[PDB]
Design an enzyme around this catalytic site. Structure first.
Site, PDB file in Angstrom:
ATOM      1  N   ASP A 184     -14.644   2.783 -12.677  1.00  0.00           N
ATOM      2  CA  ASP A 184     -14.084   3.178 -11.354  1.00  0.00           C
ATOM      3  C   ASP A 184     -14.011   4.686 -11.441  1.00  0.00           C
ATOM      4  OD1 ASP A 184     -11.019   2.293  -9.436  1.00  0.00           O
ATOM      5  OD2 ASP A 184     -12.008   4.105  -9.593  1.00  0.00           O
TER       6      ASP A 184
ATOM      7  N   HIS B 111     -13.900   0.961  -8.172  1.00  0.00           N
ATOM      8  CA  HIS B 111     -12.708   0.842  -7.329  1.00  0.00           C
ATOM      9  C   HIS B 111     -12.737  -0.480  -6.432  1.00  0.00           C
ATOM     10  CE1 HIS B 111      -8.607   2.119  -6.353  1.00  0.00           C
ATOM     11  NE2 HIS B 111      -9.058   2.189  -5.135  1.00  0.00           N
TER      12      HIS B 111
ATOM     13  N   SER C 231      -4.829   0.273  -5.911  1.00  0.00           N
ATOM     14  CA  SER C 231      -4.921   1.822  -5.670  1.00  0.00           C
ATOM     15  C   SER C 231      -3.465   2.385  -5.417  1.00  0.00           C
ATOM     16  CB  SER C 231      -5.728   2.331  -4.488  1.00  0.00           C
ATOM     17  OG  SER C 231      -6.866   1.450  -4.094  1.00  0.00           O
ATOM     18  N   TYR C 232      -3.202   2.856  -4.424  1.00  0.00           N
ATOM     19  CA  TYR C 232      -1.816   3.387  -3.977  1.00  0.00           C
ATOM     20  C   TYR C 232      -0.989   2.489  -4.238  1.00  0.00           C
ATOM     21  CZ  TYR C 232       1.541   6.909  -2.566  1.00  0.00           C
ATOM     22  OH  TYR C 232       2.610   7.917  -2.686  1.00  0.00           O
TER      23      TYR C 232
ATOM     24  N   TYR D 119       0.820  -1.155  -0.080  1.00  0.00           N
ATOM     25  CA  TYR D 119       0.025  -0.082  -0.158  1.00  0.00           C
ATOM     26  C   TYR D 119       1.115   1.182   0.078  1.00  0.00           C
ATOM     27  CZ  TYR D 119      -3.351   3.500   2.183  1.00  0.00           C
ATOM     28  OH  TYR D 119      -3.808   4.624   2.295  1.00  0.00           O
TER      29      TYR D 119
HETATM   30  C1  LIG Z   1      -9.846   7.890   1.813  1.00  0.00           C
HETATM   31  N1  LIG Z   1      -9.556   6.616   1.833  1.00  0.00           N
HETATM   32  C2  LIG Z   1      -9.809   5.714   2.668  1.00  0.00           C
HETATM   33  N2  LIG Z   1      -9.280   4.555   2.424  1.00  0.00           N
HETATM   34  C3  LIG Z   1      -8.504   4.598   1.326  1.00  0.00           C
HETATM   35  C4  LIG Z   1      -7.484   3.777   0.691  1.00  0.00           C
HETATM   36  C5  LIG Z   1      -6.709   4.127  -0.375  1.00  0.00           C
HETATM   37  C6  LIG Z   1      -5.806   3.422  -0.991  1.00  0.00           C
HETATM   38  N3  LIG Z   1      -5.179   2.842  -1.574  1.00  0.00           N
HETATM   39  C7  LIG Z   1      -7.064   5.483  -0.773  1.00  0.00           C
HETATM   40  C8  LIG Z   1      -6.361   6.148  -2.028  1.00  0.00           C
HETATM   41  C9  LIG Z   1      -5.075   6.662  -1.852  1.00  0.00           C
HETATM   42  C10 LIG Z   1      -4.157   7.072  -3.338  1.00  0.00           C
HETATM   43  C11 LIG Z   1      -5.157   6.958  -4.361  1.00  0.00           C
HETATM   44  C12 LIG Z   1      -6.169   5.984  -4.580  1.00  0.00           C
HETATM   45  C13 LIG Z   1      -6.933   5.793  -3.447  1.00  0.00           C
HETATM   46 CL1  LIG Z   1      -8.540   4.987  -3.367  1.00  0.00          CL
HETATM   47  C14 LIG Z   1      -7.912   6.471  -0.135  1.00  0.00           C
HETATM   48  C15 LIG Z   1      -7.964   7.859  -0.588  1.00  0.00           C
HETATM   49  N4  LIG Z   1      -9.057   7.949  -1.858  1.00  0.00           N
HETATM   50  C16 LIG Z   1      -8.563   5.997   0.990  1.00  0.00           C
END
Ligand SMILES: Cn1cnc2cc(C#N)c(-c3ccccc3Cl)c(CN)c21
Ligand SMILES: *[C@@H]1O[C@H](CO)[C@@H](O[C@@H]2O[C@H](CO)[C@@H](O)[C@H](O)[C@H]2NC(C)=O)[C@H](O)[C@H]1NC(C)=O
Ligand SMILES: *[C@@H]1O[C@H](CO)[C@@H](O[C@@H]2O[C@H](CO)[C@@H](O)[C@H](O)[C@H]2NC(C)=O)[C@H](O)[C@H]1NC(C)=O
Ligand SMILES: Cn1cnc2cc(C#N)c(-c3ccccc3Cl)c(CN)c21
Ligand SMILES: *[C@@H]1O[C@H](CO)[C@@H](O)[C@H](O)[C@H]1NC(C)=O
Ligand SMILES: *[C@@H]1O[C@H](CO)[C@@H](O)[C@H](O)[C@H]1NC(C)=O
Ligand SMILES: *[C@@H]1O[C@H](CO)[C@@H](O)[C@H](O)[C@H]1NC(C)=O
Ligand SMILES: *[C@@H]1O[C@H](CO)[C@@H](O)[C@H](O)[C@H]1NC(C)=O
Ligand SMILES: *[C@@H]1O[C@H](CO)[C@@H](O)[C@H](O)[C@H]1NC(C)=O
Ligand SMILES: *[C@@H]1O[C@H](CO)[C@@H](O)[C@H](O)[C@H]1NC(C)=O
Ligand SMILES: *[C@@H]1O[C@H](CO)[C@@H](O)[C@H](O)[C@H]1NC(C)=O
EC number: 3.4.14.5
Lengths: 724, 724
Positions: free
Chosen positions: A666, A698, A588-589, A505
């Site tokens: 997404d 997503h 995601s990240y 992550y």
């Molecule tokens: C608000 N929030 C709560 N849990 C999250 C988990 C993630 C992840 N991986 C991210 C995230 C970080 C960067 C790019 C896209 C995403 Cl979805 C977020 C913030 N959107 C989150």
């Protein structure tokens, strides 16, 4: 036997929960049938018989009882939107009368419903407008008239506030006795729209175009107004009058965000405001004025929270917890050494005194009495990955008691807590590293009434499967501890060499090395496929203070990525790792970091999987992205935005086996992001694996999609590692 | 040496073509700079030195010489739209004065430009409007004022009329001597839109949404009016008066098409209109009335063409070729025995006499003079897959010489022809089975003037390399003879067992079995991978009479599908096919069939690729789909619309390795169709390989995209067949 892919997919081994919703100080509701349990003795009286709404025809999705326990809200017709937002139909069941209310009912497609904190007043949001029902059977008063789809949000949040600020679709805040209704208003007029195809059902001939007001990094943002309406004044004749509270002068100077709402007293409300450059926030304390009819927030009562080393708060400035009279609060802030500790604040004084200190962090204030503050922290044994409940004595900040440490040090090191209305009782939830354990405790002396759930069911059938073990530890790197964890296959022999998969992550304030017990895909790879699943928290990670967390301020795609590599290098030197078979995967990240890593040209990783990756930060949303990257302009950070894309690393992908997966619907990380990665990899003649998921978002959370993806990933992994 | 995958993707072995453009009855143009060749002698001159348009300062994509040699039109800033349509800039360069015309320039973003057939009048379409320039340096008269993007198309076709009707963007037609300008005008007001995402360069932040008016099966269709303007009576002080010709009564009674526009004389034009249910066509012949200034089609000169066994024409009604006086015309229509032959129609009478007969078909009428008719047919050796040029004497129908048959019987069996303006000379183009061969001939005596291009260079290069061979042959089935071709591995051994790739199209009027020589992906697979790649012409395939072609009428996804499966059984039992390793692949209709075949549950195929497949006919365009299927209404054919989807056959895919490829910006067969296949495979838990191509359209033709897909496909086949 082992924990097979099927086991994971079709939940063959269930972690039993004991989810409870405290109804009062003595009692709580449980969904056995719905029961009322008594905390003292554990006796239960069937609150609602399972087949009462068998005479309804609709599938009851959720229930909600008014605080005076007179009516129950029934939610059906659930249609989810984003992470928290959804639409639904509602019926109020008069418990006394024992029948549904029929006239002046709650509309179809209500976006939000919430009971006042006491009584049975009911506020809801329909068509982007706010409505109040003082009584469940009487008509509702229309608060807002400005509500307009995709444009003006009254009482509910626009895409970005939902996701990145409030983690909630609700933007309504009742006062403690329900006298006032406070709400935010969102203007998206000039926010541009992310557009993508929805293919829907096979029967749909022309795919629909979904269009969400979504601000990408640097784009024009939603603007926000804040209102409070006196619900103890509402005329059936005259339009309800909403009193505005404007943001601080120091916020009005440019793009801001309302970032926290907290009621202090019956006539005192606190508002946190953040600049778009998220290193400066101001908290306003707003008092009601009877002989004025308006709301005052003295420039004298303002409190600033800022950060020179980065952004403020973990994800946003921490919320305050006000002592009964509301002349003092506590909120978790970064201290002088950069560790997040509780600070006692006096409404009228600029300076707070820290009531906790040390090289660990306060996770969150949990309950505040007149004698004691209860908080959760990772102090125990210096383990950032653990969580315990602590009681700190108000008259003596030295008198700190760990209330969950000793309960069971062996199987329990990660606790969450739930307090009854008045904190007379609390429910402890340890979720690792042994099976999750739910227990009830009385706070007046902290003795433990009884075990609620212990997972003997699970515990039993488990000694049958060859289960994997977790190892939580730390490597030293530049004279600093970085914690990692490994899901280690059954009968782990350290003289044998194993394939390793790095689960990533590694976003800011991420923590993937914890003491939580989990049955997931990693469990299967470890149990059946004998693959070590390792996770590491490098620079940028949270709960270890600012020096670590802020290390990637203005520099996403640098250190948090370098350290995943470094870690995998350090794993290889641990003896039991087959350095010819090391993979990395993330969502995601994690997708982003995985891709960044796979394109680093380090030679360490034979392969990887990136699900729903951010490809470049100008593609992701403003709030989250700018919070760490600033603005994508020459006068700010454009250089690094330009420099931190997975596209630019396309040439190095020739060195690895890549699997790119993304959902076509997404709303969050837009398919666009993987669409550009692929075009990038194509343009340089890199062969890779891809997989779209039609109308998945997503989550990729559809029962079958989830089953499809993990199988696809399992096949890819098994194949990357020469595993039949 | 072998023909490697690189050889194919980098064009190591090029086929020299000899592309010429006739300019008089005795001279033609050819690039080396532009050269004029005298057809009688072969003596060459330099028409335009390349040294004249570098001072231009824009890359020249194409050129057009005015039919009188006075001017040359230069084409730059070419921006491709659909199959035929494109935006481009144009300049006009004087050849007598030798300088670029600087005044009254053709506007940027011109959709189409065309010289008059004689002189140097110039008609062009800009912003959906038609303009005319009598002299290039002069201002242009504007013909239409009704034009509006995506709604009113004057002189250019809309999406569907481009793809399925005219195979052209152009909807202008000059009368033989430039006196009149006939044009169609298309009306799309009510045509639903396909909307898809176009992501563009990485720097594009929000993806763009392409939306094209696109009638899907059963949807609201465009409407076409037709006009004729007299360009010799234009004036720069009164708007051009356009004379409409209305469609006949039998067409206005329902939804119809304008399917063919063909001039007969300076004052006579033939129109062909088609009913939406494409089994009935009417040809109106319309004479210009001298006093009126209007056009008039007499009902006594109407002509009906209709099938009872399916649709009219191969893909549309054939065009007529008129005698110099326009009192008579020749036309390929299907005889009463189901075979397409040249009929001789008299302008006034109803019945026509067929001037060719036989159990073969005429492909195209290539030229007619006062004494002869020149046509291409598949008669020689009774091979529907061969093509020779024939000369038939207008005065004696039994006097029919074959101009190409014996020219070179071994290397040459698939000809096409380009005649000089008055048909004194003709270039012959041999395509196979041997290396292509270009020759020039004079038709007076039908002798070979000279060898234009003989691919000596290529022949030299192939003498080392172990190229594949091609077997063209047939098989009896339900007592009818069905052709097929096999590209065979070098040193083919009838006693070995080869993996088989079946290469498919199999859509209505297809021919994947011919004598043409190809240097494509099948050459790689055969040459380098020792895979036999076969194509089979089953039911529905063209150039073999209506008995075979019309067999799939109202029944797409049946016999063509089934006849492909039987083909595989037939090959397998020839003794040299490893029946365990048989694959199938296709593009477009090919994709569909493959997909349908892999859903068959026949157990014959181990794997298949489907690139850009149709998945459900309600997704594909009206003109093409309804031609074979009729309307998707309950009272017509909805039933079979619903049976012939790949989705419904998804459960069966558990038996086969499926790779599904699709370009995200595919305007033709929309990504939707693939997105739906993927969804269905997910819903039944079938694993498969997928690959999307960002921004690639139906051809997935961008240089780097094309290489990526065949590399990918090569891996998928290579591993499915267990080839290292
Ligand atoms: C608000 N929030 C709560 N849990 C999250 C988990 C993630 C992840 N991986 C991210 C995230 C970080 C960067 C790019 C896209 C995403 Cl979805 C977020 C913030 N959107 C989150
Ligand atoms: C939301 O904000 C938008 C944009 O700032 C407002 O729209 C403008 O309103 C002003 C004054 O009414 C007009 O002069 C402009 O024409 C509008 N501009 C745009 C871009 O539309 C809108 O008034 C706001 N809506 C609410 C309810 O606050
Ligand atoms: C193309 O056809 C459409 C109808 O499909 C025309 O639109 C009509 O225009 C007339 C005159 O303005 C109206 O009375 C009708 O009600 C319109 N119909 C619809 C559905 O809009 C359109 O004008 C034609 N285009 C042109 C300019 O020739
Ligand atoms: C106009 N045109 C010229 N060559 C074509 C080839 C094909 C094919 N295969 C098709 C076709 C048939 C069914 C489904 C989708 C397509 Cl693209 C068409 C018709 N567009 C063609
Ligand atoms: C539990 O028991 C007490 C006394 O035994 C009883 O009075 C009370 O109503 C019970 N509470 C519930 C709701 O179970
Ligand atoms: C809540 O505040 C209101 C506002 O004036 C006040 O009347 C009341 O005392 C409070 N609620 C109750 C009845 O406890
Ligand atoms: C309240 O305000 C709205 C918008 O200004 C208006 O349309 C409506 O008539 C008003 N209703 C009442 C109760 O006055
Ligand atoms: C070919 O030669 C003839 C005379 O021998 C000459 O008149 C003619 O122009 C030549 N053709 C060209 C233009 O090359
Ligand atoms: C086309 O555009 C370019 C620059 O955008 C300009 O220089 C040129 O004059 C234009 N051509 C015409 C014919 O208007
Ligand atoms: C031609 O027609 C258009 C509208 O159809 C009009 O605007 C223009 O002025 C006309 N010009 C003349 C000369 O009639
Ligand atoms: C072309 O045809 C028109 C109409 O028939 C005729 O009047 C005209 O003279 C012809 N033009 C020439 C010179 O070829």
């Amino acid at each position: 036997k082992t924990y097979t892919l099927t086991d994971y997919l079709k939940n063959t081994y269930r972690l039993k929960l004991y989810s409870l919703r405290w109804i009062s100080d003595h009692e709580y509701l449980y969904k056995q049938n719905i029961l009322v349990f008594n905390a003292e003795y554990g006796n239960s009286s069937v609150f609602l018989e399972n087949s009462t709404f068998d005479e309804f025809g609709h599938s009851i999705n959720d229930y909600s009882i008014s605080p005076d326990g007179q009516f129950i809200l029934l939610e059906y017709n659930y249609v989810k939107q984003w992470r928290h937002s959804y639409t639904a139909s509602y019926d109020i069941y008069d418990l006394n009368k024992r029948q549904l209310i029929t006239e002046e009912r709650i509309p179809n497609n209500t976006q939000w419903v919430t009971w006042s904190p006491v009584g049975h007043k009911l506020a809801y949001v329909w068509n982007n407008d706010i409505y109040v029902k003082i009584e469940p059977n009487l008509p509702s008063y229309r608060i807002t008239w400005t509500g307009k789809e995709d444009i003006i949000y009254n009482g509910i949040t626009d895409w970005v506030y939902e996701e990145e600020v409030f983690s909630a679709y609700s933007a309504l805040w009742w006062s403690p006795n329900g006298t006032f209704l406070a709400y935010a208003q969102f203007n998206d007029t000039e926010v541009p729209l992310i557009e993508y195809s929805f293919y829907s059902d096979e029967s749909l001939q022309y795919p629909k175009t979904v269009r969400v007001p979504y601000p990408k990094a640097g784009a024009v943002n939603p603007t926000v107004k804040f209102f409070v309406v006196n619900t103890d004044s509402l005329s059936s004749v005259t339009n309800a009058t909403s009193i505005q509270i404007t943001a601080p002068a120091s916020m009005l100077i440019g793009d801001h965000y309302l970032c926290d709402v907290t009621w202090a007293t019956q006539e005192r409300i606190s508002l946190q405001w953040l600049r778009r450059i998220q290193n400066y926030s101001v908290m306003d304390i707003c008092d009601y004025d009877e002989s004025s009819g308006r709301w005052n927030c003295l420039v004298a009562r303002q409190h600033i929270e800022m950060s020179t080393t980065g952004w403020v708060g973990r994800f946003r400035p921490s919320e305050p917890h006000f002592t009964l009279d509301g002349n003092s609060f506590y909120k978790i802030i970064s201290n002088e050494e950069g560790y997040r500790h509780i600070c006692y604040f006096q409404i009228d004084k600029k300076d707070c005194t820290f009531i906790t200190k040390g090289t660990w962090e306060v996770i969150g204030i949990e309950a505040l009495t007149s004698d004691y503050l209860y908080y959760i922290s990772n102090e125990y044994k210096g383990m950032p990955g653990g969580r315990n409940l602590y009681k700190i004595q108000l008259s003596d900040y030295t008198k700190v008691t760990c209330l969950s440490c000793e309960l069971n040090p062996e199987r329990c090191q990660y606790y969450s807590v739930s307090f009854s209305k008045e904190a007379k009782y609390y429910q402890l939830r340890c979720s690792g590293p042994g099976l999750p354990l739910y227990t009830l405790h009385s706070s007046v002396n902290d003795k433990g009434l009884r075990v609620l759930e212990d997972n003997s069911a699970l515990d039993k059938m488990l000694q049958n499967v060859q289960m994997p073990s977790k190892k939580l530890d730390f490597i030293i790197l530049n004279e600093t501890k970085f914690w990692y964890q490994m899901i280690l296959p059954p009968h782990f022999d350290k003289s044998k060499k194993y394939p390793l998969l790095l689960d990533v992550y590694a976003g800011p304030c991420s923590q993937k090395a914890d003491t939580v017990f989990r049955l997931n895909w990693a469990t299967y790879l470890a149990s059946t496929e004998n693959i070590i699943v390792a996770s590491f928290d490098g620079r940028g990670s949270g709960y270890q203070g600012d020096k670590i967390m802020h290390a990637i301020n203005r520099r996403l795609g640098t250190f948090e990525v370098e350290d995943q590599i470094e870690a995998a290098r350090q794993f290889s030197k641990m003896g039991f790792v087959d350095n010819k078979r090391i993979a990395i995967w993330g969502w995601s990240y994690g997708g982003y970091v995985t891709s960044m890593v796979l394109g680093s040209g380090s030679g360490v990783f034979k392969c990887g999987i990136a699900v729903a990756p951010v490809s470049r930060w100008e593609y992701y949303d403003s709030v989250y992205t700018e919070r760490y990257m600033g603005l994508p302009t020459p006068e700010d950070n454009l250089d690094h935005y330009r420099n931190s894309t997975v596209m630019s690393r396309a040439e190095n992908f020739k060195q690895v086996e890549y699997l790119l997966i993304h959902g076509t619907a997404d709303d969050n990380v837009h398919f666009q992001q993987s669409a550009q990665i692929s075009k990038a990899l194509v343009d340089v003649g890199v062969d890779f694996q891809a997989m779209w998921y039609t109308d998945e978002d997503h989550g990729i959370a559809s029962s079958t999609a989830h089953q499809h993806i993990y199988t696809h990933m399992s096949h890819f992994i098994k194949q990357c590692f020469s595993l039949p």
